[PDB]
Amino acid sequence: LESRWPRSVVDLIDVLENELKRQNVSNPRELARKQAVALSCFLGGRQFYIPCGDTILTALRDDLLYCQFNGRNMEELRRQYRLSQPQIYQIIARQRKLHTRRHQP
DNA sequence: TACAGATCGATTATGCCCCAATAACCACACTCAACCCATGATGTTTTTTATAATGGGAGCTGTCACGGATGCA
Numbered sequence: 001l002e003s004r005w006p007r008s009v010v011d012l013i014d015v016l017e018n019e020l021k022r023q024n025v026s027n028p029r030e031l032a033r034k035q036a037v038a039l040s041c042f043l044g045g046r047q048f049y050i051p052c053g054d055t056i057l058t059a060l061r062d063d064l065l066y067c068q069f070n071g072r073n074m075e076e077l078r079r080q081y082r083l084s085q086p087q088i089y090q091i092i093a094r095q096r097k098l099h100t101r102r103h104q105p
Numbered sequence: 106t107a108c109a110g111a112t113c114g115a116t117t118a119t120g121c122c123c124c125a126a127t128a129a130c131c132a133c134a135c136t137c138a139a140c141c142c143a144t145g146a147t148g149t150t151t152t153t154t155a156t157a158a159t160g161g162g163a164g165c166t167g168t169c170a171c172g173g174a175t176g177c178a
Contacts, residue, residue: 004113
């Protein structure tokens with residue numbers, strides 16, 4: 001029944017709304033409701049799978065680390081993030097080129 | 106009145122970008138020897154002594170008894 005339960009829709013409104021109130025946006029409840037309608041029309045009937053495993057959260061977790069990376073602070077960014085240096089080496093090199101084009105398009 | 110189908114809607118398959126680790130390959134470095142060259146303290150060797158000095162035995166060894174040469178007288 002859950003696989004055919006119209007319960008998720010309402011779950012989308014508050015998840016939207018609690019963010020809008022966090023972003024100090026006016027009329028967050030009504031704003032979230034019409035957004036939920038917008039999701040329903042596009043996503044209606046489509047087999048639509050979204051990335052799991054904090055996929056956007058890491059890519060953002062990636063960004064601010066590169067902001068804190070000073071070329072010497074490898075170890076403290078290791079402790080603060082629990083990520084091991086090997087991957088940090090790779091992500092920092094990637095973010096290097098990423099922000100390289102950011103600073104120099 | 107009895108018997109059929111028909112679309113909404115769910116589990117299953119198959120493949121790959123990423124990617125969170127995987128391992129080799131290359132880069133620069135401090136600490137600890139190793140040997141040498143002094144300074145000097147310790148070691149080793151050589152030289153000289155001007156009253157006069159002028160021959161030991163150093164402890165013997167304490168004792169058997171055959172044979173075969175052996176060098177003489």
